[PDB]
Amino acid sequence: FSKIKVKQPVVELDGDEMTRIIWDKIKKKLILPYLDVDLKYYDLSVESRDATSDKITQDAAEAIKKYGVGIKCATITPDEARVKEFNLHKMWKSPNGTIRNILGGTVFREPIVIPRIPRLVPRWEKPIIIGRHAHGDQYKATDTLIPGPGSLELVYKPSDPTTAQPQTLKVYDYKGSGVAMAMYNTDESIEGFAHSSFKLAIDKKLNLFLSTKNTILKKYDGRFKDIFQEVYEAQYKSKFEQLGIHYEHRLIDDMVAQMIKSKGGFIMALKNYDGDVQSDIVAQGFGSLGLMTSILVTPDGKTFESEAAHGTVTRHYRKYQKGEETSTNSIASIFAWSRGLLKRGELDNTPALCKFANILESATLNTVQQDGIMTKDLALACGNNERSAYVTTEEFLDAVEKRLQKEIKSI
Amino acid sequence: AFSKIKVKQPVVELDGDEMTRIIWDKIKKKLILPYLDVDLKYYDLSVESRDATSDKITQDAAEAIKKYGVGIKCATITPDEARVKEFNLHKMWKSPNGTIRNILGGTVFREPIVIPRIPRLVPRWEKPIIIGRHAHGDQYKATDTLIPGPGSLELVYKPSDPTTAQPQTLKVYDYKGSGVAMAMYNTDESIEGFAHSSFKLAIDKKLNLFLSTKNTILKKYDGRFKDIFQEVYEAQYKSKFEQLGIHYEHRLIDDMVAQMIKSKGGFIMALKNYDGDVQSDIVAQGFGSLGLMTSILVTPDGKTFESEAAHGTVTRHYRKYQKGEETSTNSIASIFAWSRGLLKRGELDNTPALCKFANILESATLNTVQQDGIMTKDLALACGNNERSAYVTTEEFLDAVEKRLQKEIKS
Ligand SMILES: O=C(O)CCC(=O)C(=O)O
Ligand SMILES: O=C(O)CCC(=O)C(=O)O
């Protein structure tokens, strides 16, 4: 096969355990044999991050910004148990949280639909896309234990007193021990969130819903509502009217209820935390947490980070190390690669690359849909409880490879 | 019965707004007052009443509930920008529910009202899912504000007793541009109450209990909910759980909502204030309709209760009612607010006759739909029946329930 020439380099972030094993096979068998790619490799395994005191994560984020497209393998955020078992320096923060904070933007999540997989919410016939604000709020929050009675205040001091007033807000007078936290966001970040959301709505020709709790957090959430409306009237109003699509702000309560009783087919812009929770509800409702894509996008339309949206399970790895067979789904990791390559193709105007990314995806879905070859989790979701109903982690990937070859020849 | 049942202690009634107020009075006159000799401590929480008393009536009502033990509340309107304008309100008064919950503290238990006949949007949900929502702080008592430009943001705590605690000045953020900020709190006392009520309900209903948090991100704040529940659990409920064969477990909110969507129901989800607010609507919708859900606020000591109609009022229905136009609004949620409240009243006063009445009221109400197929517009549409004849009017439904109440009260 005559290899497709990728013009610009692609930033690759390796991950942990089982997904790392899967990641290497995908790269060696499904990508490298067909593409001549310059991969800027960053090892984000727990061991690598510990050894560099998490500096490797920051470097990888900056590389993505430099080159434009990053593709990331699922990683492990160590807990107390792991820190002790592997003698880590500390409970390192989520590489994902770190990358999102550095790149900023929006994380778009949507189900990977496989006809055969049963939907847990039957009426969802059309994809629901979650546009999760990638920055601030709880993920960059300051929280602390309050040991006893005392006052708690939120204090703001402008860098320039003549252009702004200081603020000292009474938060609470404790009468006993408790907890406290403060969080923030910026208008610039919220504005980018809005631009990407409106642009995706336009590009996909879908209605856009922004949801908040601005009835309770009148200033904080109210700010998201006002910025979205302002951006809407600044550059997208007539575009939406021309396409016949709509933008509407809704109370988060009402939105999730309408989402649950709908047929899908719309985009839900959500604050960082709500986007996190709801994307799992949506992924699960469509069929499986393992069938979801996740791509971080910056408002300038120049930077993308495609990540394996399905976490790795240490149990599978344990069995893998013991030489026992496994059946871990590799679809989410395959799509991280395909969606990243698609952005690379678009940015570089390399149609041959985009075509490849699309067949890689169809060959993967058809292996399941048409050939009935799948891993344990999907077989089970399908009510196929026979041992012979699924193949091993490696068998699935070998099947996809064979399919990729076959489908590539057809063209 | 036809003699009337003597309710020993007064019941606090909080009247509401628009269409729900209309249904509320009909319920009282036809389904409650004719059978019960009850002393109702009436508090009008309509928008006009609250505006006239500068929201003082809401505070008085909450204190009456604490004084007498049981309150029954009709749905109320939380004014927004437009409403303040159209009705010249003095202020955008805060939600009465948030005010009442802050004063009484405790936990709000949300549970679906199951009518087997009504289709479920999440098919596998065959067993009730109960949401135990912490009713106190977090974002419902938060302090939020806009940040005009560059400057420092700090969370400052000053202990009342310098010897037992140190002051804290935590740098929240250094703005380089305008943005938003907020701070919130909760207390060990409130969280402990939340835990006790949750474990007791689990033991009472013999269901597994899951507490969900984002303690991976909010290590101190959310970690406190996790630690207090575990302490309380091991100290006085673990043994009983083990005897009953039920389990308690803490889960990441991400995993829990996914497991919830994939499950068959049959468990209690203890959730922080905000998550409980959002997830209860998802659960209510999933079982069939937002209008089929009960909501009862319970205090830890077990002596105070506020049964509320969770089904918000709809202005369009009210406007039609005003014009004398035909209406078909569901009253099931309002009926259960009364029944559930009367049950608490009966249990506290040890009045078996009241509890029997409350139960027959509920049975008559649901059988009116389940057996007689008599229902309002929303339920009929839920059953995929769009013909006019498929449903009855608001009044017709209530008359049907009243008739069955009389039938089933002699039976
Ligand atoms: O890194 C983590 O802890 C999870 C981040 C996340 O929400 C995602 O990758 O979708
Ligand atoms: O008053 C409000 O804004 C809604 C409160 C709520 O969530 C409830 O009553 O269940």
PDB file of C-alpha atoms in Angstrom, chain B residues 177-375:
ATOM      1  CA  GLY B 177      -9.131  39.893  32.564  1.00  0.00           C
ATOM      2  CA  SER B 178     -12.747  40.223  33.662  1.00  0.00           C
ATOM      3  CA  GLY B 179     -14.702  37.222  34.866  1.00  0.00           C
ATOM      4  CA  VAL B 180     -16.802  35.708  37.616  1.00  0.00           C
ATOM      5  CA  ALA B 181     -16.238  34.291  41.075  1.00  0.00           C
ATOM      6  CA  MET B 182     -18.229  32.471  43.695  1.00  0.00           C
ATOM      7  CA  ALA B 183     -17.794  30.826  47.061  1.00  0.00           C
ATOM      8  CA  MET B 184     -19.981  28.379  48.910  1.00  0.00           C
ATOM      9  CA  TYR B 185     -20.069  26.465  52.131  1.00  0.00           C
ATOM     10  CA  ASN B 186     -21.580  23.653  54.112  1.00  0.00           C
ATOM     11  CA  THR B 187     -21.245  22.455  57.696  1.00  0.00           C
ATOM     12  CA  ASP B 188     -20.354  19.239  59.460  1.00  0.00           C
ATOM     13  CA  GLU B 189     -23.626  19.410  61.389  1.00  0.00           C
ATOM     14  CA  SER B 190     -25.716  19.686  58.227  1.00  0.00           C
ATOM     15  CA  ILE B 191     -23.789  16.933  56.421  1.00  0.00           C
ATOM     16  CA  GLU B 192     -24.163  14.643  59.440  1.00  0.00           C
ATOM     17  CA  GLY B 193     -27.906  15.222  59.460  1.00  0.00           C
ATOM     18  CA  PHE B 194     -27.938  14.457  55.718  1.00  0.00           C
ATOM     19  CA  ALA B 195     -26.174  11.145  56.437  1.00  0.00           C
ATOM     20  CA  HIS B 196     -28.458  10.075  59.282  1.00  0.00           C
ATOM     21  CA  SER B 197     -31.630  10.705  57.275  1.00  0.00           C
ATOM     22  CA  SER B 198     -30.190   8.794  54.300  1.00  0.00           C
ATOM     23  CA  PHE B 199     -29.131   5.726  56.291  1.00  0.00           C
ATOM     24  CA  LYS B 200     -32.463   5.639  58.117  1.00  0.00           C
ATOM     25  CA  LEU B 201     -34.464   5.789  54.889  1.00  0.00           C
ATOM     26  CA  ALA B 202     -32.326   2.993  53.435  1.00  0.00           C
ATOM     27  CA  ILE B 203     -32.920   0.828  56.513  1.00  0.00           C
ATOM     28  CA  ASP B 204     -36.612   1.736  56.457  1.00  0.00           C
ATOM     29  CA  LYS B 205     -37.152   0.867  52.782  1.00  0.00           C
ATOM     30  CA  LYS B 206     -34.509  -1.858  52.807  1.00  0.00           C
ATOM     31  CA  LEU B 207     -32.645  -0.494  49.780  1.00  0.00           C
ATOM     32  CA  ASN B 208     -28.986  -0.053  48.933  1.00  0.00           C
ATOM     33  CA  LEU B 209     -27.621   3.456  49.472  1.00  0.00           C
ATOM     34  CA  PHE B 210     -25.086   5.244  47.305  1.00  0.00           C
ATOM     35  CA  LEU B 211     -23.568   8.615  48.172  1.00  0.00           C
ATOM     36  CA  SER B 212     -22.134  10.352  45.095  1.00  0.00           C
ATOM     37  CA  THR B 213     -19.545  13.098  45.034  1.00  0.00           C
ATOM     38  CA  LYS B 214     -16.713  14.546  42.932  1.00  0.00           C
ATOM     39  CA  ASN B 215     -14.116  14.026  45.693  1.00  0.00           C
ATOM     40  CA  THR B 216     -11.444  13.399  43.070  1.00  0.00           C
ATOM     41  CA  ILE B 217     -11.670  17.093  42.235  1.00  0.00           C
ATOM     42  CA  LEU B 218     -12.959  18.642  45.465  1.00  0.00           C
ATOM     43  CA  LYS B 219     -10.770  16.567  47.789  1.00  0.00           C
ATOM     44  CA  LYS B 220     -11.537  18.533  50.915  1.00  0.00           C
ATOM     45  CA  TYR B 221     -15.076  19.742  50.290  1.00  0.00           C
ATOM     46  CA  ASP B 222     -16.517  16.568  48.755  1.00  0.00           C
ATOM     47  CA  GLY B 223     -14.104  14.416  50.727  1.00  0.00           C
ATOM     48  CA  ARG B 224     -15.891  15.666  53.848  1.00  0.00           C
ATOM     49  CA  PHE B 225     -19.258  14.319  52.689  1.00  0.00           C
ATOM     50  CA  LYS B 226     -17.592  10.984  51.997  1.00  0.00           C
ATOM     51  CA  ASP B 227     -15.794  10.852  55.354  1.00  0.00           C
ATOM     52  CA  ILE B 228     -18.786  11.874  57.445  1.00  0.00           C
ATOM     53  CA  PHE B 229     -21.087   9.339  55.782  1.00  0.00           C
ATOM     54  CA  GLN B 230     -18.511   6.592  56.342  1.00  0.00           C
ATOM     55  CA  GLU B 231     -17.994   7.583  60.016  1.00  0.00           C
ATOM     56  CA  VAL B 232     -21.743   7.730  60.664  1.00  0.00           C
ATOM     57  CA  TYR B 233     -22.196   4.466  58.801  1.00  0.00           C
ATOM     58  CA  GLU B 234     -19.636   2.454  60.767  1.00  0.00           C
ATOM     59  CA  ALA B 235     -20.659   4.048  64.049  1.00  0.00           C
ATOM     60  CA  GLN B 236     -24.347   3.154  64.024  1.00  0.00           C
ATOM     61  CA  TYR B 237     -25.760   1.714  60.809  1.00  0.00           C
ATOM     62  CA  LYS B 238     -23.215  -0.742  59.389  1.00  0.00           C
ATOM     63  CA  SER B 239     -24.382  -3.601  61.613  1.00  0.00           C
ATOM     64  CA  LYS B 240     -28.040  -3.045  60.691  1.00  0.00           C
ATOM     65  CA  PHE B 241     -27.256  -2.780  56.968  1.00  0.00           C
ATOM     66  CA  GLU B 242     -25.358  -6.073  57.170  1.00  0.00           C
ATOM     67  CA  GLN B 243     -28.301  -7.697  58.933  1.00  0.00           C
ATOM     68  CA  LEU B 244     -30.752  -6.501  56.286  1.00  0.00           C
ATOM     69  CA  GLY B 245     -28.504  -7.503  53.422  1.00  0.00           C
ATOM     70  CA  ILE B 246     -28.252  -3.970  52.028  1.00  0.00           C
ATOM     71  CA  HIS B 247     -25.100  -2.015  51.326  1.00  0.00           C
ATOM     72  CA  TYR B 248     -23.760   1.503  51.587  1.00  0.00           C
ATOM     73  CA  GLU B 249     -21.163   2.781  49.158  1.00  0.00           C
ATOM     74  CA  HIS B 250     -19.590   6.024  48.027  1.00  0.00           C
ATOM     75  CA  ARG B 251     -19.267   6.559  44.288  1.00  0.00           C
ATOM     76  CA  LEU B 252     -17.886   9.180  41.935  1.00  0.00           C
ATOM     77  CA  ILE B 253     -20.885  11.113  40.553  1.00  0.00           C
ATOM     78  CA  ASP B 254     -19.760  10.177  36.994  1.00  0.00           C
ATOM     79  CA  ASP B 255     -19.931   6.452  37.633  1.00  0.00           C
ATOM     80  CA  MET B 256     -23.137   6.637  39.644  1.00  0.00           C
ATOM     81  CA  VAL B 257     -25.238   8.414  37.033  1.00  0.00           C
ATOM     82  CA  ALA B 258     -23.999   5.970  34.415  1.00  0.00           C
ATOM     83  CA  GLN B 259     -24.819   2.969  36.635  1.00  0.00           C
ATOM     84  CA  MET B 260     -28.186   4.590  37.341  1.00  0.00           C
ATOM     85  CA  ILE B 261     -29.062   4.901  33.617  1.00  0.00           C
ATOM     86  CA  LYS B 262     -27.971   1.304  33.022  1.00  0.00           C
ATOM     87  CA  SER B 263     -29.812  -0.138  36.070  1.00  0.00           C
ATOM     88  CA  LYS B 264     -33.285  -1.488  36.860  1.00  0.00           C
ATOM     89  CA  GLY B 265     -33.726   0.999  39.707  1.00  0.00           C
ATOM     90  CA  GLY B 266     -34.341  -0.042  43.296  1.00  0.00           C
ATOM     91  CA  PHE B 267     -31.935   2.057  45.321  1.00  0.00           C
ATOM     92  CA  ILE B 268     -31.436   5.364  47.062  1.00  0.00           C
ATOM     93  CA  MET B 269     -29.012   7.942  45.737  1.00  0.00           C
ATOM     94  CA  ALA B 270     -27.828  10.409  48.351  1.00  0.00           C
ATOM     95  CA  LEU B 271     -26.750  13.527  46.502  1.00  0.00           C
ATOM     96  CA  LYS B 272     -25.344  16.945  47.307  1.00  0.00           C
ATOM     97  CA  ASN B 273     -27.836  19.840  46.925  1.00  0.00           C
ATOM     98  CA  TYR B 274     -27.097  20.727  43.275  1.00  0.00           C
ATOM     99  CA  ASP B 275     -26.742  17.172  41.963  1.00  0.00           C
ATOM    100  CA  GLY B 276     -29.883  16.160  43.806  1.00  0.00           C
ATOM    101  CA  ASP B 277     -31.714  19.023  42.092  1.00  0.00           C
ATOM    102  CA  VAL B 278     -30.530  18.021  38.624  1.00  0.00           C
ATOM    103  CA  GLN B 279     -30.742  14.254  39.002  1.00  0.00           C
ATOM    104  CA  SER B 280     -34.247  14.239  40.480  1.00  0.00           C
ATOM    105  CA  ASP B 281     -35.625  15.720  37.235  1.00  0.00           C
ATOM    106  CA  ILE B 282     -33.768  13.108  35.177  1.00  0.00           C
ATOM    107  CA  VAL B 283     -35.178  10.362  37.373  1.00  0.00           C
ATOM    108  CA  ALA B 284     -38.693  11.820  37.352  1.00  0.00           C
ATOM    109  CA  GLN B 285     -38.674  12.124  33.574  1.00  0.00           C
ATOM    110  CA  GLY B 286     -37.170   8.670  33.164  1.00  0.00           C
ATOM    111  CA  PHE B 287     -39.986   7.016  35.086  1.00  0.00           C
ATOM    112  CA  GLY B 288     -42.555   8.754  32.901  1.00  0.00           C
ATOM    113  CA  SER B 289     -43.395  12.346  33.797  1.00  0.00           C
ATOM    114  CA  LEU B 290     -42.054  15.258  35.841  1.00  0.00           C
ATOM    115  CA  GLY B 291     -45.569  15.568  37.187  1.00  0.00           C
ATOM    116  CA  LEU B 292     -45.301  12.143  38.812  1.00  0.00           C
ATOM    117  CA  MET B 293     -42.830  12.755  41.610  1.00  0.00           C
ATOM    118  CA  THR B 294     -43.097  13.414  45.317  1.00  0.00           C
ATOM    119  CA  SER B 295     -40.851  15.698  47.302  1.00  0.00           C
ATOM    120  CA  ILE B 296     -40.575  15.702  51.072  1.00  0.00           C
ATOM    121  CA  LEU B 297     -38.122  17.632  53.206  1.00  0.00           C
ATOM    122  CA  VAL B 298     -37.153  15.770  56.369  1.00  0.00           C
ATOM    123  CA  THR B 299     -35.092  16.994  59.350  1.00  0.00           C
ATOM    124  CA  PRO B 300     -32.529  14.653  61.022  1.00  0.00           C
ATOM    125  CA  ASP B 301     -34.308  14.614  64.404  1.00  0.00           C
ATOM    126  CA  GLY B 302     -37.319  13.079  62.676  1.00  0.00           C
ATOM    127  CA  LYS B 303     -39.882  15.563  63.963  1.00  0.00           C
ATOM    128  CA  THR B 304     -40.187  18.074  61.128  1.00  0.00           C
ATOM    129  CA  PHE B 305     -41.533  17.547  57.605  1.00  0.00           C
ATOM    130  CA  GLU B 306     -42.447  19.675  54.601  1.00  0.00           C
ATOM    131  CA  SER B 307     -44.334  17.822  51.858  1.00  0.00           C
ATOM    132  CA  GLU B 308     -44.261  19.853  48.651  1.00  0.00           C
ATOM    133  CA  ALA B 309     -45.919  19.660  45.245  1.00  0.00           C
ATOM    134  CA  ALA B 310     -42.904  19.278  42.945  1.00  0.00           C
ATOM    135  CA  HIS B 311     -44.927  19.791  39.754  1.00  0.00           C
ATOM    136  CA  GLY B 312     -44.355  23.451  38.905  1.00  0.00           C
ATOM    137  CA  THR B 313     -47.255  25.538  37.619  1.00  0.00           C
ATOM    138  CA  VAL B 314     -47.719  26.459  33.963  1.00  0.00           C
ATOM    139  CA  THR B 315     -48.735  30.005  33.043  1.00  0.00           C
ATOM    140  CA  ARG B 316     -50.369  29.056  29.725  1.00  0.00           C
ATOM    141  CA  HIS B 317     -52.814  26.823  31.592  1.00  0.00           C
ATOM    142  CA  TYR B 318     -53.496  29.623  34.032  1.00  0.00           C
ATOM    143  CA  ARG B 319     -54.020  32.164  31.251  1.00  0.00           C
ATOM    144  CA  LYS B 320     -56.541  29.806  29.650  1.00  0.00           C
ATOM    145  CA  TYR B 321     -58.219  29.300  33.016  1.00  0.00           C
ATOM    146  CA  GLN B 322     -58.448  33.089  33.318  1.00  0.00           C
ATOM    147  CA  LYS B 323     -60.104  33.407  29.891  1.00  0.00           C
ATOM    148  CA  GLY B 324     -62.519  30.683  30.934  1.00  0.00           C
ATOM    149  CA  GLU B 325     -60.979  28.323  28.388  1.00  0.00           C
ATOM    150  CA  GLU B 326     -60.892  24.552  28.872  1.00  0.00           C
ATOM    151  CA  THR B 327     -58.018  23.234  31.011  1.00  0.00           C
ATOM    152  CA  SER B 328     -56.388  19.824  31.522  1.00  0.00           C
ATOM    153  CA  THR B 329     -53.668  20.162  34.153  1.00  0.00           C
ATOM    154  CA  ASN B 330     -52.462  17.230  36.235  1.00  0.00           C
ATOM    155  CA  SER B 331     -53.172  17.379  39.975  1.00  0.00           C
ATOM    156  CA  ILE B 332     -51.622  14.086  41.040  1.00  0.00           C
ATOM    157  CA  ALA B 333     -48.452  15.745  42.349  1.00  0.00           C
ATOM    158  CA  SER B 334     -50.480  18.216  44.443  1.00  0.00           C
ATOM    159  CA  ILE B 335     -52.679  15.412  45.785  1.00  0.00           C
ATOM    160  CA  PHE B 336     -49.648  13.443  46.950  1.00  0.00           C
ATOM    161  CA  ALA B 337     -48.176  16.509  48.634  1.00  0.00           C
ATOM    162  CA  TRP B 338     -51.306  16.513  50.798  1.00  0.00           C
ATOM    163  CA  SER B 339     -51.443  12.746  51.339  1.00  0.00           C
ATOM    164  CA  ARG B 340     -47.739  12.391  52.194  1.00  0.00           C
ATOM    165  CA  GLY B 341     -47.995  15.343  54.548  1.00  0.00           C
ATOM    166  CA  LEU B 342     -51.079  13.916  56.249  1.00  0.00           C
ATOM    167  CA  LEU B 343     -49.262  10.589  56.647  1.00  0.00           C
ATOM    168  CA  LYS B 344     -46.410  12.290  58.493  1.00  0.00           C
ATOM    169  CA  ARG B 345     -48.988  14.152  60.610  1.00  0.00           C
ATOM    170  CA  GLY B 346     -50.818  10.923  61.400  1.00  0.00           C
ATOM    171  CA  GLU B 347     -47.630   9.086  62.356  1.00  0.00           C
ATOM    172  CA  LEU B 348     -46.439  11.903  64.629  1.00  0.00           C
ATOM    173  CA  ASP B 349     -49.817  12.155  66.394  1.00  0.00           C
ATOM    174  CA  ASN B 350     -50.324   8.388  66.331  1.00  0.00           C
ATOM    175  CA  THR B 351     -53.614   8.753  64.466  1.00  0.00           C
ATOM    176  CA  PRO B 352     -54.109   5.545  62.438  1.00  0.00           C
ATOM    177  CA  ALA B 353     -57.359   6.834  60.953  1.00  0.00           C
ATOM    178  CA  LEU B 354     -55.536   9.722  59.253  1.00  0.00           C
ATOM    179  CA  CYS B 355     -52.925   7.427  57.720  1.00  0.00           C
ATOM    180  CA  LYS B 356     -55.624   5.104  56.393  1.00  0.00           C
ATOM    181  CA  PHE B 357     -57.361   8.069  54.773  1.00  0.00           C
ATOM    182  CA  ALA B 358     -54.105   9.323  53.256  1.00  0.00           C
ATOM    183  CA  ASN B 359     -53.443   5.907  51.738  1.00  0.00           C
ATOM    184  CA  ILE B 360     -56.917   5.525  50.259  1.00  0.00           C
ATOM    185  CA  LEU B 361     -56.571   9.040  48.854  1.00  0.00           C
ATOM    186  CA  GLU B 362     -53.393   7.946  47.047  1.00  0.00           C
ATOM    187  CA  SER B 363     -54.941   4.667  45.876  1.00  0.00           C
ATOM    188  CA  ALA B 364     -58.071   6.366  44.538  1.00  0.00           C
ATOM    189  CA  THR B 365     -55.921   8.927  42.740  1.00  0.00           C
ATOM    190  CA  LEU B 366     -53.689   6.401  40.979  1.00  0.00           C
ATOM    191  CA  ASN B 367     -56.434   3.856  40.266  1.00  0.00           C
ATOM    192  CA  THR B 368     -58.406   6.670  38.619  1.00  0.00           C
ATOM    193  CA  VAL B 369     -55.660   6.599  35.988  1.00  0.00           C
ATOM    194  CA  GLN B 370     -54.459   2.991  36.163  1.00  0.00           C
ATOM    195  CA  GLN B 371     -57.862   1.248  36.125  1.00  0.00           C
ATOM    196  CA  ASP B 372     -60.369   3.799  34.860  1.00  0.00           C
ATOM    197  CA  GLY B 373     -58.080   5.334  32.241  1.00  0.00           C
ATOM    198  CA  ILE B 374     -59.231   8.795  33.352  1.00  0.00           C
ATOM    199  CA  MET B 375     -56.325  11.226  32.976  1.00  0.00           C
TER     200      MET B 375
END
